[PDB]
Design a protein around this nucleic acid. Structure first.
Lengths: 82, 96, 109, 92, 92, 109, 81, 97
DNA sequence: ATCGATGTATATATCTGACACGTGCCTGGAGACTAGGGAGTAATCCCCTTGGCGGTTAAAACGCGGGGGACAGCGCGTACGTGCGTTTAAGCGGTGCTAGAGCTGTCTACGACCAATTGAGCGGCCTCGGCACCGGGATTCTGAT
DNA sequence: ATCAGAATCCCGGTGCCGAGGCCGCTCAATTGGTCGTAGACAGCTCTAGCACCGCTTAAACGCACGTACGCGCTGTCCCCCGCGTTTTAACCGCCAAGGGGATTACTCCCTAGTCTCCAGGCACGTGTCAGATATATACATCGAT
């Protein structure tokens, strides 16, 4: 149903993220590498969150599932627990 | 016409003062739904769940870019290259 | 007849709820039994840490001329304090932003 | 009945900054922080009781867990606050 | 009197490598590995039971904890082994 | 009263189901433990042990040795991608390191 | 008693770097390595002594060191028994 | 028949990556451990296995750090590791200076 | 220096929507009392940690020459930044509809508990084979020619 | 290509000490019965997640042009490596002592469990004021001269 959605992470958005990281000049090959890195990270988080959702017999991924998935990857997130 | 680097420094200052999300919401939501199709079909998402995913992803990428910038400055460059990202992820222990 | 009920928080001179912390300790599967003073000690520690963070965030808000604390002020308070940053190193504050920081070598000649 | 720490956090804020308010998003951040620190201290204290073949969690386990988890000067003042609270409570 | 996994590790070794022995230092490594993995899986199963307001750890929690903790193809074969063992156990 | 059978033999396992059940009860993990949870846990532990032992035995044979030492366990773990991912933050005592020299340091020509 | 950090000699640091695959070592590396090792050891020993004191013992055991390493994400195999 | 610079270093790399023995002398390391621990509690006793475990952890940590430092040095087109490389590796790891 | 373009900082007014306070009730916290078993304490024993000494030899320390590697400077060519005109789709507001999350009740299967029994696993003793160490011959590899 | 010499590999003999097997016994796992409640399942409420449409406008996109920068090359010199000699201290063994860790027994006081009671803390409601937006305008900053 959905295809080529990683392109939706556009080059200006990646540039903005790198600006917040303090980067001054960006190589043109950075954008595809960043897209791949983001896809890997998202795949790992979403896999754990969906495992939590399946365990609960739910069909909806809740924010608590995402919080627990992040927590178990050593990336604790504040502000979504309630 | 400004010299190359002035606008970049202004953009750095502007985006380091603010706290809003830098990725557009609808494309990220579509990406999240596409990725989750490989794990379970007909999955629904709370809006707060997608927002949590976006916050985590943007924080992760910004931190990665900070480390990448350090690696680029180590090689006496001002331009970040894919090898800088690879080195930073390798030192962090992330999967290649 | 029964004496007037006195909260365990007020007995220990605390704002944080001693009884709720006791109930959470009993039901968390942490141990078979919970001592009388463990909830008091835990509540005092939690209240102290909350006070430290709130004080730093209030200072950050006042310096910004704001009268309300938002997640940005909490992030500024945590990241600018060496010990709090060491305790909350692996944590992401949602809408907290980053510390403004530009490398010296990147600055104009 | 969705329990939280908002009322006690608000009381603490009014103690340290009587003039200053807090937004709801920042209150959620505070709730997450309190829950996280509770989980950390309780887990360390549970491990300490299990390591020493004890079935009870006392204020000694809490103090040792605080010494293990909190850095530097944070641990000293937190230990002082906990000891003061326990002493005051023991004297009613 | 200190319990360990040496006799079952040796039985498994004789099943997979009949002619191969093992030194005591390697046996200590193996015991540490078994205890570490047991603790990881039990902690994740306890968290899963707590998250869903359940008071029982069953094979469903062990299976989910395995899927969470083991990587890639390790999780698939471990899940298959666990299911086969439980099926054999309940039939007998 | 029948001839008593170990639960491990019923499940066809070498690892002890009863000891795993007792360790789960002693653990402070949950109020109750189901009947199949120790069997499942024992089967998983046995499978992981067998995988590591098979790889370590192959490493020992490749070195013309008949006894597994910590070096062989380290070589088995670090050469297998899944096991390396599982045991990534683990230090094997007396295990050493994988032989690996960066190609840029090799002699020219 | 006093000057023990110099007991970690230059040839020992060279051996550790050789096991890490290092071909050439700058002369300023030895002092930096001594500082790094001192910090690491101080953290681990502080945690282990806290574990020892909680048990009201006067002797640091290997189990204390294993727990101290474990709580720093440095899990150590082969000393648990 | 003097060996060129780098040949003996490569031989040493091969030798020390093939072996598993400890590379720090035991008696100086034990003195270091006892000296450091004195600042936390006086009149402390140590099991021999405790000191052995500490030494194993320390050597493993330093070897991993030297691997990351070597990668940092190669990133800057050098073959010599320098204190800046150790500092960068420790900073990217998230360890404290 | 120097003036121009311009993005940014300061001053004041408006409003709106989110924070701060008030109310009812109910459900979680407090007081009282009893039982029992967890833990504190004292005595004991024996093991394992610390200290000392002598030797002897491997390792560490020191000195020195040299070559190779770090670093600075320069040239060049290309790839990135910036600005502008066009197009694309994100965001928002509104509506409709249904999947499914959350809650309640019923009931039965399943897991805790207890007492008796027995066989698995532990600790201690003994032996013999895997591994290490040595010595000598063969091959490899390195560096200068 | 050549050839000398150091390093390494291989092959065999010796020995020693640790892994592996055997036996007694004791205590942990097993069996059988009972009963209490956790959770599985069905049913109902009504929330919120999804789909669709239309409009607006900001962001994204594509192109052109210039120059800043990455990278390759060369020269210099200094600082690391390799090696021989002297010193020093680690390691090993052997002996002594006593400190403190593990165990057992005894007692009591601290915590769980139950019941009763009541007042704290949470959903609902609503007003007023903190900050965002708007506009005007000073002003510091860049950058070519």
């Amino acid at each position: 149903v959905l295809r080529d959605n990683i392109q939706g992470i556009t080059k200006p958005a990646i540039r903005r993220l790198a600006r917040r990281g303090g980067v001054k000049r960006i190589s043109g090959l950075i954008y595809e590498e960043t897209r791949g890195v983001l896809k890997v990270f998202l795949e790992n988080v979403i896999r754990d969150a969906v495992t939590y959702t399946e365990h609960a017999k739910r069909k909806t991924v809740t924010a608590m599932d995402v919080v627990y998935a992040l927590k178990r990857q050593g990336r604790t997130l504040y502000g979504f627990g309630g | 016409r400004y010299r190359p680097g002035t606008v970049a420094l202004r953009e750095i200052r502007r985006y380091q003062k603010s706290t809003e999300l830098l990725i557009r919401k609808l494309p990220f939501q579509r990406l999240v739904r596409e990725i989750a199709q490989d794990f379970k079909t007909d999955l629904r998402f709370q809006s707060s769940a997608v927002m949590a995913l976006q916050e985590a992803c943007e924080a992760y990428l910004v931190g990665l870019f900070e480390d990448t910038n350090l690696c680029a400055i180590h090689a006496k460059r001002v331009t970040i290259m894919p090898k800088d990202i690879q080195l930073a992820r390798r030192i962090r222990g992330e999967r290649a | 007849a029964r004496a007037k009920a006195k909260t365990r928080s007020s007995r220990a001179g605390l704002q944080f709820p001693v009884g709720r912390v006791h109930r959470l300790l009993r039901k968390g599967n942490y141990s078979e039994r919970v001592g009388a003073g463990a909830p008091v000690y835990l509540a005092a520690v939690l209240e102290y840490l909350t006070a430290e963070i709130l004080e730093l965030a209030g200072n950050a808000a006042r310096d910004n001329k704001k009268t309300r604390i938002i997640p940005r002020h909490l992030q500024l308070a945590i990241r600018n304090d060496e010990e709090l940053n060491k305790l909350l190193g692996r944590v992401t504050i949602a809408q907290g932003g980053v510390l403004p920081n530009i490398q010296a070598v990147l600055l104009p000649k | 009945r969705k329990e939280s720490y908002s009322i006690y956090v608000y009381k603490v804020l009014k103690q340290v900054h009587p003039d200053t308010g807090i937004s709801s998003k920042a209150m959620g951040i505070m709730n997450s922080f309190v829950n996280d620190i509770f989980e950390r201290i309780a887990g360390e204290a549970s491990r300490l009781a299990h390591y020493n073949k004890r079935s009870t969690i006392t204020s000694r386990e809490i103090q040792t867990a605080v010494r293990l988890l909190l850095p530097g000067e944070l641990a000293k003042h937190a230990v002082s606050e906990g000891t003061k609270a326990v002493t005051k409570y023991t004297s009613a």
